PDB file of all heavy atoms in Angstrom:
ATOM      1  N   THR B 169     118.170 139.106 172.394  1.00  0.00           N
ATOM      2  CA  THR B 169     117.449 139.518 173.601  1.00  0.00           C
ATOM      3  C   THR B 169     116.658 138.385 174.282  1.00  0.00           C
ATOM      4  O   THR B 169     116.008 138.639 175.300  1.00  0.00           O
ATOM      5  CB  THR B 169     116.562 140.698 173.240  1.00  0.00           C
ATOM      6  OG1 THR B 169     115.601 140.293 172.252  1.00  0.00           O
ATOM      7  CG2 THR B 169     117.384 141.878 172.668  1.00  0.00           C
ATOM      8  N   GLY B 170     116.744 137.156 173.776  1.00  0.00           N
ATOM      9  CA  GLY B 170     116.084 136.028 174.377  1.00  0.00           C
ATOM     10  C   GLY B 170     114.601 135.865 174.008  1.00  0.00           C
ATOM     11  O   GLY B 170     113.905 135.051 174.645  1.00  0.00           O
ATOM     12  N   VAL B 171     114.124 136.680 173.098  1.00  0.00           N
ATOM     13  CA  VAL B 171     112.739 136.600 172.620  1.00  0.00           C
ATOM     14  C   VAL B 171     112.781 135.797 171.322  1.00  0.00           C
ATOM     15  O   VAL B 171     113.847 135.570 170.750  1.00  0.00           O
ATOM     16  CB  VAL B 171     112.047 137.968 172.477  1.00  0.00           C
ATOM     17  CG1 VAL B 171     112.142 138.753 173.790  1.00  0.00           C
ATOM     18  CG2 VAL B 171     112.629 138.763 171.323  1.00  0.00           C
ATOM     19  N   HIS B 172     111.612 135.350 170.862  1.00  0.00           N
ATOM     20  CA  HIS B 172     111.537 134.428 169.745  1.00  0.00           C
ATOM     21  C   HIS B 172     110.849 134.997 168.506  1.00  0.00           C
ATOM     22  O   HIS B 172     109.933 135.817 168.610  1.00  0.00           O
ATOM     23  CB  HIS B 172     110.922 133.118 170.221  1.00  0.00           C
ATOM     24  CG  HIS B 172     111.696 132.530 171.382  1.00  0.00           C
ATOM     25  ND1 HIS B 172     111.177 132.548 172.671  1.00  0.00           N
ATOM     26  CD2 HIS B 172     112.943 132.011 171.425  1.00  0.00           C
ATOM     27  CE1 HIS B 172     112.107 132.008 173.450  1.00  0.00           C
ATOM     28  NE2 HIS B 172     113.185 131.650 172.751  1.00  0.00           N
ATOM     29  N   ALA B 173     111.323 134.565 167.353  1.00  0.00           N
ATOM     30  CA  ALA B 173     110.765 134.940 166.064  1.00  0.00           C
ATOM     31  C   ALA B 173     110.584 133.718 165.183  1.00  0.00           C
ATOM     32  O   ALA B 173     111.338 132.732 165.229  1.00  0.00           O
ATOM     33  CB  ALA B 173     111.692 135.934 165.353  1.00  0.00           C
ATOM     34  N   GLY B 174     109.554 133.803 164.362  1.00  0.00           N
ATOM     35  CA  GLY B 174     109.218 132.702 163.471  1.00  0.00           C
ATOM     36  C   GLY B 174     108.284 133.124 162.396  1.00  0.00           C
ATOM     37  O   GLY B 174     107.988 134.324 162.228  1.00  0.00           O
ATOM     38  N   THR B 175     107.804 132.143 161.652  1.00  0.00           N
ATOM     39  CA  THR B 175     106.991 132.393 160.488  1.00  0.00           C
ATOM     40  C   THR B 175     105.580 131.810 160.625  1.00  0.00           C
ATOM     41  O   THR B 175     105.344 131.005 161.517  1.00  0.00           O
ATOM     42  CB  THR B 175     107.685 131.669 159.256  1.00  0.00           C
ATOM     43  OG1 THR B 175     107.614 130.247 159.410  1.00  0.00           O
ATOM     44  CG2 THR B 175     109.114 132.094 159.037  1.00  0.00           C
ATOM     45  N   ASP B 176     104.704 132.157 159.682  1.00  0.00           N
ATOM     46  CA  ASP B 176     103.432 131.446 159.578  1.00  0.00           C
ATOM     47  C   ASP B 176     103.812 130.122 158.755  1.00  0.00           C
ATOM     48  O   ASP B 176     105.000 129.934 158.382  1.00  0.00           O
ATOM     49  CB  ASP B 176     102.390 132.313 158.854  1.00  0.00           C
ATOM     50  CG  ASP B 176     102.781 132.771 157.488  1.00  0.00           C
ATOM     51  OD1 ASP B 176     103.629 132.111 156.871  1.00  0.00           O
ATOM     52  OD2 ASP B 176     102.260 133.804 157.032  1.00  0.00           O
ATOM     53  N   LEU B 177     102.849 129.249 158.415  1.00  0.00           N
ATOM     54  CA  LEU B 177     103.162 127.998 157.700  1.00  0.00           C
ATOM     55  C   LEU B 177     103.371 128.190 156.178  1.00  0.00           C
ATOM     56  O   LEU B 177     103.698 127.233 155.477  1.00  0.00           O
ATOM     57  CB  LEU B 177     102.184 126.861 158.011  1.00  0.00           C
ATOM     58  CG  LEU B 177     102.542 126.041 159.272  1.00  0.00           C
ATOM     59  CD1 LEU B 177     103.855 125.338 159.113  1.00  0.00           C
ATOM     60  CD2 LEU B 177     102.620 126.909 160.529  1.00  0.00           C
TER      61      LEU B 177
END
Side-chain angles (χ1 to χ4, degrees):
Chain B
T169 62
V171 306
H172 304 107
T175 68
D176 57 24
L177 274 296

